[PDB]
Design a protein around this ligand. Structure first.
Ligand SMILES: Cc1cc2nc3c(=O)[nH]c(=O)nc-3n(C[C@H](O)[C@H](O)[C@H](O)COP(=O)(O)OP(=O)(O)OC[C@H]3O[C@@H](n4cnc5c(N)ncnc54)[C@H](O)[C@@H]3O)c2cc1C
Length: 421
């Protein structure tokens, strides 16, 4: 429509992709991008990878060049916080009291770092204690990635691991702490955690699992952290502390406007929230996965792209792409880590290749059904695995771990079985 105005709250990948996708699918109306961030929209993955390593330019981070917004006639309103939504009048209220009218509203609010309780007040304020989510966070941390200085990373998720890998390369003394018994405990099988723990320790990282931070010591003059204290009495001297204990989806605007919320903004098969004219997308969206027949909220680039493209399609009267298996990647010590599917609910894993080398695939199964596959330096088996998950192919479990049998042929057999019998 060339009259309907669309307002997108959030200028992260999700919001920006909706904006440009919209104008790419034939949208003629007005598009307004509104975000509290001041910087030009940029990619996030490089922030714990090449950019954090200081090897990529700031320019390379832009999602789209600044001129692109003008050319595609997309109004970008940065440094502006949306404080409320008025479904009745169909307007979004800005912190300055200003209100923007909308015919279609898209909430691409993403999430915010989960604060560490024992790092409140002065601790969190210290210039050498940071979470990693914004460009500002990344640059503040990078400036402090100094050889021989001591870093303590709190949190063992993929980003924590990527931060540790980057710091190690910068020759820092690195210690990583996780409360769980093994890193990535919730999304991987023990032998996979073992791989990562050994991988990092081998690189020089001192990983301490089952460790809980009880507090910090700080300098009076500089108001900087000088040490991290563990519940068991261990004192870890630190020149830098990076915390990453998860993300909190930004649903406040939704829950305040009476929209359904549950660890994310609930949306239906049409990307719509409880309110027809309001949609949600990206890290903040909790949707129903028909592939796994359950409600999930995914934090990944592929997820944002897929969801953003679906919204653009629907708002333009076009047909959305069929639901694809969820996937994401991680870069640690130049190792190609690619994960497809959701492992939740697996009752066994099958390793294809040796875990003593960064070259294998791990299949997560629930019975004979493949739920997900984590691949390490195996791009082809990764692509092939997407097909197995997305199409629910009946691949023979007893051959998945047999490297003398190409995955392509295992797949061929599964497909032939459907057509023949
Ligand atoms: C360091 C890092 C590394 C990552 N690496 C990978 C990776 O390797 N592979 C992968 O697949 N994914 C990775 N991710 C995750 C991926 O970047 C995100 O899932 C993806 O970019 C989608 O983000 P989003 O746009 O949904 O949310 P966000 O990027 O959080 O964007 C939401 C924006 O909206 C703003 N906003 C919220 N509320 C309001 C409001 N009321 N008014 C105005 N503005 C508001 C927020 O401040 C924010 O600026 C990484 C993320 C980080 C931080």
């Amino acid at each position: 429509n060339a009259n309907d105005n669309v307002v997108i709250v959030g200028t992260g990948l999700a919001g920006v992709e909706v904006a440009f996708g919209l104008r790419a699918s034939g949208w003629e109306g007005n598009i307004r991008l509104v975000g509290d961030a001041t910087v030009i929209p940029h990619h996030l993955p490089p922030l714990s990878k090449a950019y954090l390593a200081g090897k990529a330019t700031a320019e390379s981070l832009y999602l789209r060049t600044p001129d692109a917004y003008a050319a595609q006639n997309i109004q970008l309103l940065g440094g502006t916080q949306v404080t409320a939504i008025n479904r009745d009048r169909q307007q979004v209220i800005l912190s300055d009291g200003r209100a923007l009218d909308y015919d279609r509203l898209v909430l691409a609010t993403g999430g915010r770092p989960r604060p560490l309780p024992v790092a409140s007040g002065a601790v969190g304020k210290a210039n050498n204690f940071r979470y990693l989510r914004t460009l500002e966070d990344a640059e503040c941390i990078r400036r402090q990635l100094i050889a021989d200085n001591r870093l303590v990373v709190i949190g063992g998720g993929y980003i924590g691991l990527e931060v540790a890998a980057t710091a190690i390369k910068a020759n820092m003394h690195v210690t990583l702490l996780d409360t769980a018994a093994r890193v990535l405990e919730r999304v991987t099988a023990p032998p996979v955690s073992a791989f990562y723990e050994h991988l990092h320790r081998e690189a020089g990282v001192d990983i301490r699992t089952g460790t809980q931070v009880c507090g910090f010591e700080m300098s009076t003059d500089q108001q900087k952290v000088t040490a991290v204290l563990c519940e068991d009495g261990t004192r870890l001297p630190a020149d830098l502390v990076i915390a990453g204990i998860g993300l909190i989806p930004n649903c406040e605007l939704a829950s305040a406007a009476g929209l359904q919320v549950d660890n994310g903004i609930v949306i239906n098969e049409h990307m719509q929230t409880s309110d027809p004219l309001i949609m949600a997308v990206g890290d903040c969206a909790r949707f129903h996965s028909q592939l796994y027949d359950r409600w999930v909220r995914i934090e990944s680039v592929p997820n944002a792209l897929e969801q953003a493209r679906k919204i653009a399609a629907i708002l333009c009267g076009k047909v959305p792409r069929d639901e694809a298996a969820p996937w994401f990647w991680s870069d640690q010590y130049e190792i190609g880590l690619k994960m497809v599917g959701l492992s939740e609910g697996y009752d066994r894993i099958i390793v294809r290749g040796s875990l003593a080398q960064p070259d294998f695939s791990v299949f997560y199964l629930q019975g004979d059904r493949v739920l997900a596959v984590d691949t390490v330096n195996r791009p082809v088996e990764f692509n092939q695995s997407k097909q197995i998950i997305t199409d629910r192919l009946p691949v023979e479990p007893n051959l998945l771990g047999d490297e003398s049998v190409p995955l392509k042929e295992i797949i061929a057999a599964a497909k032939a079985e459907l057509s023949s019998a």
